[PDB]
């Protein structure tokens, strides 16, 4: 239930998400590409799903990957902005869930993004506390897959 | 090319885009739904394209339409944020162009959005000068369709 998952976003969790996003969201291009490259490096079995982006090993030099990465960061910006209203958070989460359902991405595979999130957060001096907060947001999307 | 279309957006145009977005973008849910509902009212022939959203006449109450509309506003937020770097604007515009090319939306059909944009801008007292500025940004997307 995406609704029960959304209920897990308590006051403390929402605060950690916002505080960490202020830093991470300030460089969408850089952190977005870092997130994607980390995903591909740590989970090579996921590269097949991104055939449309071409050679993802080119990282920032790949125009399609950069466009994709920047756009992905605005999906997260969207989620953060909807934290105040669960009804709105849910409808945007389901809209994005559809985009992945069509690509045949399961809740389990979507969850593979938690590893990269923790690593990027760590490189910015945000520990486990913050990685767990983000895992709860990711869990809302997983509930819709 | 798309680059030529973007590279042409002048300082005055970007200024008008940013000033109007400060207001329009401060209420993404309200203005996004208003944009979509206006498109369906003035161009009923486009309704068929949005069958995934269910009954679009339900407006705000339709969760799928609400989620689509809010998300649409973040694509625009993305564009506005990339105005000072044509290279980044181009790659995000091309990514979004693919989403519509797959739905068989032509450059001409995409331009139908200019009417609704003009009307919603007018509701917030932003005149022709501003509508012309947005038509120029829409033209950047049309260059990719
Ligand atoms: C923080 C989590 C994630 C976010 C916010 C996110 C966001 C996005 C966005 C905005 C798009 C573009 C949607 C479209 O235009 O159709 C997208 C595409 C895609 N995502 Fe994700 N995603 C996430 C995690 C994942 C994971 C972990 C996988 C797979 C292991 C995945 C697989 C895909 C694929 C295959 C595409 C299509 C790429 C293309 O061909 O353009 N995503 N994602
Ligand atoms: C300011 C102009 C516009 C913006 C920024 C915009 C934005 C978006 C976004 C972000 C999506 C979701 C992409 C995806 O998940 O695959 C979308 C989907 C779509 N757009 Fe647009 N769009 C615009 C104008 C139009 C116009 C004028 C038409 C048609 C006359 C159109 C037809 C569609 C269709 C059919 C979909 C698929 C909806 C669905 O089934 O989920 N768009 N648009």
From Swiss-Prot, chains A, B:
Q: Name one GO cellular component term.
A: cytoplasm
Q: Where is the Globin domain?
A: 8-145
Q: Which InterPro entries match?
A: Globin, Globin-like_OT, Globin-like_sf, Globin/Proto, Mb-like_M
Q: Which CDD domains match?
A: Mb-like (cd01040)
The record's subcellular location field reads: Cytoplasm
The record's section on PROSITE patterns has: GLOBIN
Q: Name the SUPFAM superfamilies for this protein.
A: Globin-like (SSF46458)
Molecular function as annotated in GO: heme binding; identical protein binding; metal ion binding; oxygen binding; oxygen carrier activity
Keywords, alphabetical: Cytoplasm, Heme, Iron, Metal-binding, Oxygen transport, Transport
Q: Which Pfam families match?
A: Globin
Q: Which residues bind heme b?
A: 100
What is stated as this protein's family in its record? Belongs to the globin family.
Q: What interactions and quaternary structure are annotated?
A: Homodimer.
Q: What is this protein called?
A: Globin-1
What is the species of this protein? Anadara inaequivalvis (Inequivalve ark)
């Amino acid at each position: 239930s995406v609704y029960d998952a959304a209920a897990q976003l308590t006051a403390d969790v929402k605060k950690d998400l916002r505080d960490s996003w202020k830093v991470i969201g300030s460089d969408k291009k850089g952190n977005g590409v870092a997130l994607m490259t980390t995903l591909f490096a740590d989970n090579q079995e996921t590269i097949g799903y991104f055939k449309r982006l071409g050679d993802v090993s080119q990282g920032m030099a790949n125009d399609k990957l950069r466009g994709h990465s920047i756009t992905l960061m605005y999906a997260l910006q969207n989620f953060i902005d909807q934290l105040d209203n669960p009804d709105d958070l849910v409808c945007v989460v389901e809209k994005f869930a559809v985009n992945h359902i069509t690509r045949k991405i399961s809740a389990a595979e979507f969850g593979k993004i938690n590893g990269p999130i923790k690593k990027v957060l760590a490189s910015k001096n945000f520990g486990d506390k913050y990685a767990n907060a983000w895992a709860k947001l990711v869990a809302v999307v997983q509930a819709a897959l």
